[PDB]
Design an enzyme around this catalytic site. Structure first.
Site, PDB file in Angstrom:
ATOM      1  N   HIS A  46       0.637  -1.056  -0.059  1.00 21.07           N
ATOM      2  CA  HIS A  46       0.005  -0.260  -0.089  1.00 21.07           C
ATOM      3  C   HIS A  46       0.984   1.026   0.077  1.00 21.07           C
ATOM      4  O   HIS A  46       0.355   2.357  -0.348  1.00 21.07           O
ATOM      5  CB  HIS A  46      -0.547   0.125   0.651  1.00 21.07           C
ATOM      6  N   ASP A  97      -1.110  -7.175   1.814  1.00 20.95           N
ATOM      7  CA  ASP A  97       0.008  -6.039   1.692  1.00 20.95           C
ATOM      8  C   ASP A  97       1.631  -6.612   2.403  1.00 20.95           C
ATOM      9  O   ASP A  97       1.360  -5.874   3.201  1.00 20.95           O
ATOM     10  CB  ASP A  97      -0.955  -5.118   3.091  1.00 20.95           C
ATOM     11  N   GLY A 196       1.327   6.632   9.157  1.00 25.38           N
ATOM     12  CA  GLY A 196       3.505   7.294   8.972  1.00 25.38           C
ATOM     13  C   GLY A 196       4.237   5.861   9.401  1.00 25.38           C
ATOM     14  O   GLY A 196       5.324   5.660   8.623  1.00 25.38           O
ATOM     15  N   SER A 198       2.884   3.147   8.661  1.00 27.83           N
ATOM     16  CA  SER A 198       2.261   1.687   8.163  1.00 27.83           C
ATOM     17  C   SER A 198       3.895   0.855   7.313  1.00 27.83           C
ATOM     18  O   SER A 198       4.925   1.551   6.865  1.00 27.83           O
ATOM     19  CB  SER A 198       1.775   2.059   6.436  1.00 27.83           C
TER      20      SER A 198
END
Ligand code: UI3
Length: 245
Positions: A46, A97, A196, A198
């Site tokens: 992502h 992800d 921020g 991730s």
């Protein structure tokens, strides 16, 4: 990271700081990541899916502050950006992800382990810690949901793993969270990852060894009641990680 404590990279030496160069020369922070082997960093798809051009990205190892050249850091470009072929983003839930970035210095080298630069071990198949286990997270993400800026100094905190059946309760996430995902939170809802953070590490000490159990993926709000952080469960992906590296 909402709450927690400021830290430095010598406590977190597998943490990768990923940035993006924009047309016109400005550079901004994108996402964290983890060093799996000298030539390979793992993060979340992502963070890159909208700008999937390997050339836009800068990866640092050994860096402790958002806008300062820490003594001993190394800077890298991305030789290969590998996004999972079946990734998708629902309203809240992100699917498959995970992503790999093969890294390379300007001289063509992978990372060189030092005191502030180290790999984290991957999990073994069917072997995750039990719910209730404390694990740590690290990132440069927001300190408060209403902030627009990120902290200058690296932060960290500790959260506890939550079972699939608890995280699937109606006031939690219902059937939106799947068996390929792991939930973790503060019992008192005062600390969490946030925007921020991730792509960064959820590290759990498992049978004596620090292990990359999760990757920061999604959540509803930050540090909100009955809404855990949700993480990509790395052990499910060992066949994919293997064949693509
Ligand atoms: C783009 O935002 C993101 C992106 C990724 C997240 C990953 C985990 C968590 C979490 N709660 N553990 C929150 C996240 C948020 C997120 C959730 N809401 N907030 S905020 C700053 O209130 O808009 C941001």
């Amino acid at each position: 990271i909402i709450g927690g404590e400021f830290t430095t990279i010598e406590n977190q030496p597998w943490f990768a700081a990923i940035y993006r160069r924009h047309r016109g020369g400005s550079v901004t922070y994108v996402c964290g990541g983890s060093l799996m082997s000298p030539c390979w960093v793992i993060s979340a798809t992502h963070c890159f899916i909208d700008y999937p051009k390997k050339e836009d990205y800068i990866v640092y190892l050994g860096r402790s502050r958002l806008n300062s050249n820490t003594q001993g850091e190394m800077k890298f470009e991305v030789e290969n950006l590998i996004l999972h072929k079946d990734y998708s983003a629902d309203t809240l839930a992100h699917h498959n992800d995970i992503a790999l970035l093969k890294i390379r210095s300007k001289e063509g080298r992978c990372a060189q382990p030092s005191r502030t630069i180290q790999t984290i071990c991957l999990p073994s198949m069917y072997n995750d810690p039990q719910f209730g286990t404390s694990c740590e997270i690290t990132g440069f993400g927001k300190e408060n949901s209403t902030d627009y800026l990120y902290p200058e100094q690296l932060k960290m905190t500790v959260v506890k793993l939550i079972s699939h059946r608890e995280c699937q309760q109606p006031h939690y996430y219902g059937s939106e969270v799947t068996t390929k995902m792991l939930c973790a939170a503060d019992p008192q809802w005062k600390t969490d990852s946030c925007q921020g953070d991730s792509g960064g590490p959820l590290v759990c000490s498992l049978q004596g060894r620090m292990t990359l159990t999760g990757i920061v993926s999604w959540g509803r709000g930050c540090a909100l009641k009955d809404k855990p952080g949700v993480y990509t469960r790395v052990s499910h992906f060992l066949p994919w990680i293997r064949s693509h590296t």
